[PDB]
Design a binder for these strands. Structure first.
Ligand SMILES: [Zn+2]
Ligand SMILES: [Zn+2]
Ligand SMILES: [Zn+2]
Lengths: 396, 585, 186, 187
RNA sequence: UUAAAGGUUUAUACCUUCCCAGGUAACAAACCAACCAAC
């Protein structure tokens, strides 16, 4: 059966660098239950796998960032790094690609569900997370399409869509090359058979699918997380037009997403000893720790200082009531100590000194007035760098 | 978080069953729970067992564990009892002094306010305990007003006469002007006010402030209001100066105002001054006189009731600039000849419960005998002034105490100001009485005024007294003496000139019967204060303590300007009455 | 953990065992003085364990509660703390354009609408008396918000017009005093 | 743990122990005396450790079934709320202008989006500016959805009443301008 | 320096095993609550 539902439209209240009133979707409960009883088991495996292309569920602490970056560098010949971002992923994604993502997610029910069950589950999904009826300010409106951020499988569907766009860009880059000039016989035969498998075959050829997947994994290595991606690619093949460049991404976005992408969202890196320029809003820096060169992520210091200075509730304005609030910020801001720029490390040192001052202030309101002392000794480590240095050391 | 009522020590423990929830220090709270029936302890969270389905609310059975409070049955293994070692665990435990004796606080917080002893403890305890006693007495009165049933208009027999059906299972309040009701209009899902009303026996004769066309459905309840906490004392500390401080007397004064010039200077010699004014002495004449005597001083005139402050405005309008005067009215028809709600004006007129937060050169309290420690404390929290002038009279009536049933409240227990002037004497005194003839003045001077009250008029030879018990009949909440009324009727036939008199009695039912029999205007003694008439006829109607109140009787027979007739049932007051006696016809 | 009675018991046991060891008495007799000695720590290192846990329950119970006496008090006084902080920072800023209107508004002069930034729009100000009229307006000019505004209109509180030369000090009371003034940015 | 039977055995063994210890017979006699109490301290052990660990599980059972009862009452409350909400929102259905259009369907199925279009008896237009007001909601009566509607009430963003005479071109800048105009379907 | 081995229970001492109690430390798993970051 089909169960149409209503998803409310809530308005968020958070810190940001641009004045847009971001909104979120309060989806109903029936859809939540029935979508859980599918994708709980579908996605708990995705979130618990290490070393795959999709890096959802992998932490950056205890050497996770270094492992991810070394995995994405897995045997590329002339490596260059490239990154891009979709301008409006949620509000401009066509319905066909969302249906495709849902189908490849439901591909795992070959045993427990017959064809009718799969079709009706797909119909329920299309009815309540694709073209549902949204209640925005006490009135019901029809949703044209896109995706509803706030459902169970938003990030995983976004990852599927990202991989689909990347593969489409690679296919377009390969098929549009002259072909008479390709000097490698294997690549020319690959192009010939790719055309045959696209526009001359009605059935799937698993052998060539495996071959092309191996080719892409060898020459175009991806790291995907929702709508963010970092790719290491063979520079020579990209220059020759045998793998997808950035203009191939732009053309694909233009003709398959109704969106024109500019250079404000994409970047390239010719030296891979610096790591990605940006991934999940964290910059990567190659530091030395314990006779080894590792990659550490540091954030934009303005973000940390703004989080320190501006607060959501007024209770958070008083330091003594929220000290773990500053411990977490110091944990996030520790990697700034290694930056060549001095002020970046001054941020972390200032946070430590403020934590010490907050602890002393908390002790004073107590001893003086209601005579009691709670200094303890587990607090003394909160203003020493060892507690934070241990967070970026690979031993857990 | 607050301050311990007995120690001023910082504390967070509030006695849970104690109505005003006073802050009690750990030792004080421990004694208050161990010496009374108060067993609920309120802190930041209650010290109530947070186990599901438990009713344990006594702190002496509670143990702290993990991050919560449990009863012994539900407690975890590791804990220490919340009530141990002569103190209750809580905020500010180390900073705690305790009190040697907790008897007065326990007596006030446990009394039902039905005995004169409760009021004597309330007006003779410490200032902080005085404030707590005022708070709990007003709260108890407010809750007791809710104990009365709902009266709903069943039938409108005519105008000024109604038919009321009363709520079952609840008492009906006494039907007198001391019980002010309020109507409510039936709506779709709620109720809306239709004004304030008073009721009297007929059917029931109703007198509303605003006339209406009420029909079947309207109901009346005694309006209650939230009881606010107190911080300021009933009296600011006494200060005596060598010169007039913060004031500048005028160099030109009129002979209307010369008699009080010396008293106007004494007002400047002390922080606060207590003034006693006999009937017809010029209490309004004096208080408005302080305004012209100190023209540049900013003076706030305050009083408990709307009536007195308006009468001050009426006398102020006669002597003070209309542009510099203001009448503050909360969002009852009152004075409307001054600009309304102008706090920053030089001369501000307002009542106790509506005064704004401001400062002034002088603050004038009128009608202090009807004032309580609550009204004394509230205004001092609202007004900070260089000089303070209390005007009133112990020999006049107090504010009614509905809950009081046992004993009589002496004037020195009405409030703090009445206590001082009844013990240390009034700071000033006006010895001239201008309204009544000498015979009433001489009678009331000996009775209550230490023979200090002097008359301005001579003997009028129209002050007449008769000793007549009659027959006393009682209705639901009052008394009637028809033979006493019948004597007055016979007096009127033989003395037709006395039909311009005003009938006064301590009972509303007596007034209701006399109004239909005699036709004279009728006034209760409590409502007659502040008025005057040429002739009055007074019927005691009983020998009860209500009728024999030496403050009331002073108020009763002193509303006459020329002559008086007093039909007396009490022999004691009859002998004290220096009037010409008659034989019963 | 010193002020307990079974501390005195442990001290007696320790003294007895010290005597036994310093004397070298026997083999089973000192076992009796270590029989009733190592058990003395089984009713000491226990009863001094629950109580030592109880104390840290206390210091930190007294803590989850000062910070609620504090949290629930701090969100109940926002309206004055925010305002005082605002004016403290505004005074610390030390800008002439802000200070001019701060002083004008503290004594007499409040505008009736947002001060416009363009060189065209209208400004309406309330002048309560002549004293401020001296300080601010001089002839056909009006200095306010550190800018020059030419007057186009002045009307009294009774909505009647008034001219720009009558205004003086001999018609001191012959003018209603809450004058309102309209001006245009120069 | 005092009303347990083993307390009596422990007490009587200890009483005999102290009596004969004050008597002080001999080791050959006190051996049984100090072994009987040593096994009585072991009995009270067993049964006292077989009891105080069941008071925890009984308490846990009481709390658990307290919680389950609370849940079962909340379920009934929410059931009643949902059913009464359905029944009170059904009573606005206008069950005569909706039955006619339903009966004309070939199968009885009609799209949802045409139910309020042809049956609802109140229209609320939201207007961002005066120019859009001119082309859509001009005058006291207008037409929409192939029907004629007549204006009754107009409010601004602050939900305060606006008369139809105030909506001019020059007076427009003095209005909060998501104007909500509500009207009834006229016949 | 005092024939030999074997026999029994009891007392003592040691060692070993099991069981029952009391405390300390660790490890993990669950539950509950507050906080921070990312899309
Ligand atoms: Zn109490
Ligand atoms: Zn105390
Ligand atoms: Zn309990």
């Amino acid at each position: 059966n089909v169960i149409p539902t209503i998803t409310q439209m809530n308005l968020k209240y958070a810190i940001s660098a641009k004045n847009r009133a971001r909104t979120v979707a309060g989806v109903s409960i029936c859809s939540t239950m029935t979508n859980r009883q599918f994708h709980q088991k579908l996605l708990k495996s995705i979130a618990a796998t290490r070393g795959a292309t999709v890096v959802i569920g992998t932490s950056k602490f205890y050497g996770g960032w270094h492992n991810m970056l070394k995995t994405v560098y897995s045997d590329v010949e002339n490596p260059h790094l490239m990154g891009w971002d979709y301008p409006k992923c949620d509000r401009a994604m066509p319905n066909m690609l969302r249906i495709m993502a849902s189908l490849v997610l439901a591909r795992k029910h070959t045993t427990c569900c017959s064809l009718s069950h799969r079709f009706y589950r797909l119909a329920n999904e299309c009815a309540q997370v694709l073209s549902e009826m949204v209640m925005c300010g006490g009135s019901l409106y029809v949703k044209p399409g896109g995706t509803s951020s706030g459902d169970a499988t938003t990030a995983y569907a976004n990852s599927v869509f990202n991989i689909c766009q990347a593969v489409t860009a690679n296919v377009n880059a390969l098929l549009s090359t002259d072909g008479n000039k390709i000097a490698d016989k294997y690549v020319r035969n690959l192009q010939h058979r790719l055309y045959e498998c696209l526009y001359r075959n009605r059935d799937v050829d698993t052998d060539f699918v495996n071959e092309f997947y191996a080719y892409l994994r060898k020459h175009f290595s991806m790291m995907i997380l929702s709508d963010d991606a970092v790719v290491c690619f063979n520079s020579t093949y990209a220059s020759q037009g045998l793998v997808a460049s950035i203009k191939n991404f732009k053309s694909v976005l233009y003709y398959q997403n109704n969106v024109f992408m500019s250079e404000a969202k994409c970047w390239t890196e010719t030296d891979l000893t610096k790591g990605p320029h940006e991934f999940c809003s964290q910059h990567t820096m190659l530091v030395k720790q314990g006779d080894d060169y590792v990659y550490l992520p540091y954030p934009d210091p303005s973000r940390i200082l703004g989080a320190g200075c501006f607060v959501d509730d007024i209770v958070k304005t008083d330091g003594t009531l929220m000290i773990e609030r500053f411990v977490s910020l110091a944990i996030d801001a520790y990697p700034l100590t290694k930056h060549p720029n001095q002020e970046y490390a001054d941020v972390f040192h200032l946070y430590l000194q403020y934590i010490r001052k907050l602890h002393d202030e908390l002790t004073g309101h107590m001893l003086d007035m209601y005579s009691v002392m709670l200094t303890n000794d587990n607090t003394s480590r909160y203003w020493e760098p060892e507690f934070y240095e241990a967070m970026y050391t690979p031993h857990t | 978080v607050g301050a311990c009522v007995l120690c001023n020590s910082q504390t967070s423990l509030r006695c849970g069953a104690c109505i005003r929830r006073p802050f009690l220090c750990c030792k004080c709270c421990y004694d208050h729970v161990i010496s009374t029936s108060h067993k609920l302890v309120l802190s930041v969270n209650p010290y109530v067992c947070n186990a599901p389905g438990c009713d344990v609310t006594d702190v002496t059975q509670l143990y702290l564990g993990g991050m919560s409070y449990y009863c012994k049955s539900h407690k975890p293994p590791i804990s220490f009892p919340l009530c141990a070692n002569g103190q209750v665990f809580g905020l500010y435990k180390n900073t705690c002094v305790g009190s040697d004796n907790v008897t007065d606080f326990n007596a006030i917080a446990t009394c039902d306010w039905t005995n004169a002893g409760d009021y004597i403890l309330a007006n003779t305890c410490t200032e902080r305990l005085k404030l707590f006693a005022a708070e709990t007495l007003k709260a108890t009165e407010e809750t007791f007003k809710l104990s009365y049933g709902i009266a709903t208009v069943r039938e409108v027999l005519s105008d000024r006469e109604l038919h009321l059906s009363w709520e079952v299972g609840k008492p009906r309040p006494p039907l007198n002007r001391n019980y002010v009701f309020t109507g409510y209009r039936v709506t779709k899902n709620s109720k809306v006010q239709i004004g304030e009303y008073t009721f009297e026996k007929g059917a029931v004769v109703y007198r509303g402030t605003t006339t209406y066309k009420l029909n079947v459905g309207d109901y009346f309840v005694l309006t209650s209001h939230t009881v606010m906490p107190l911080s300021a004392p009933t009296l600011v500390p006494q200060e005596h100066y060598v010169r007039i401080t913060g004031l500048y007397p005028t160099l030109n004064i009129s002979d209307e105002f010369s008699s009080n010039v010396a008293n106007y200077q004494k007002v400047g010699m002390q922080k606060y001054s207590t003034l006693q004014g006999p009937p017809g002495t010029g209490k309004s004449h004096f208080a408005i006189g302080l305004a012209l005597y100190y023209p540049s001083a900013r003076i706030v005139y305050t009083a408990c009731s709307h009536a007195a402050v308006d009468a001050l405005c009426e006398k102020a309008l006669k002597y003070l600039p209309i542009d510099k005067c203001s009448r503050i009215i909360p969002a009852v028809e009152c004075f409307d000849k001054f600009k309304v709600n102008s706090t920053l004006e030089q001369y501000v007129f307002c009542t106790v419960n509506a005064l704004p937060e401001t400062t002034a050169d002088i603050v004038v309290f009128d009608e202090i005998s009807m004032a309580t420690n609550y009204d004394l404390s509230v205004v001092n929290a609202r007004l900070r002034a260089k000089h303070y002038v209390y005007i009133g009279d112990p020999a006049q009536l107090p504010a009614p105490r509905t809950l009081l049933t046992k004993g009589t409240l002496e004037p020195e227990y009405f409030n703090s100001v009445c206590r001082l002037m009844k013990t240390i004497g009034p700071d000033m005194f006006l010895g001239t009485c201008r309204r009544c003839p000498a015979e009433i003045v001489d009678t009331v001077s000996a009775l209550v005024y230490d023979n200090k009250l002097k008359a301005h008029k001579d003997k009028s030879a129209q002050c007449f007294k008769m000793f007549y018990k009659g027959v006393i009949t009682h209705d639901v909440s009052s008394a009637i003496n028809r033979p006493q009324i019948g004597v007055v009727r016979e007096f009127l036939t033989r003395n037709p000139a006395w039909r311009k008199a005003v009938f006064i009695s301590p009972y509303n039912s007596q007034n209701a019967v006399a109004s239909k029999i005699l036709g004279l205007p009728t006034q209760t003694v409590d409502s007659s204060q502040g008025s005057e008439y040429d002739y009055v006829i007074f019927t005691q109607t009983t020998e009860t303590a209500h009728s024999c109140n030496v403050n009331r009787f002073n108020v009763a027979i002193t509303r006459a300007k020329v002559g008086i007739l007093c039909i007396m049932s009490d022999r004691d007051l009859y002998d004290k009455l220096q009037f010409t006696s008659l034989e019963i016809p | 953990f010193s002020s307990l009675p079974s501390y005195a018991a442990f001290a007696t046991a320790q003294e007895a065992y010290e005597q036994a060891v310093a004397n070298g008495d026997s083999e089973v007799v000192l076992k009796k003085l270590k029989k009733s000695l190592n058990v003395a720590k089984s009713e000491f290192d226990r009863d001094a364990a629950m109580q030592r846990k109880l104390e840290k329950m206390a210091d930190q119970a007294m803590t989850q509660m000062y910070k609620q006496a504090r949290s629930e008090d701090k969100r109940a006084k926002v309206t004055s703390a925010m305002q005082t902080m605002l004016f403290t920072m505004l005074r610390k800023l030390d800008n002439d354009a802000l200070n001019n209107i701060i002083n004008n508004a503290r004594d007499g002069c409040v505008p009736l609408n947002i001060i416009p930034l363009t060189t065209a729009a209208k400004l309406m100000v309330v002048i309560p008396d002549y004293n401020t009229y001296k300080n601010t307006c001089d002839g056909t000019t009006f200095t306010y918000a550190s800018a020059l505004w030419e007057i186009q209109q002045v009307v009294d509180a009774d909505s009647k017009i008034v001219q720009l030369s009558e205004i003086s000090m001999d018609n001191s009371p012959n003018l209603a005093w809450p004058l309102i003034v309209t001006a245009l940015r120069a």
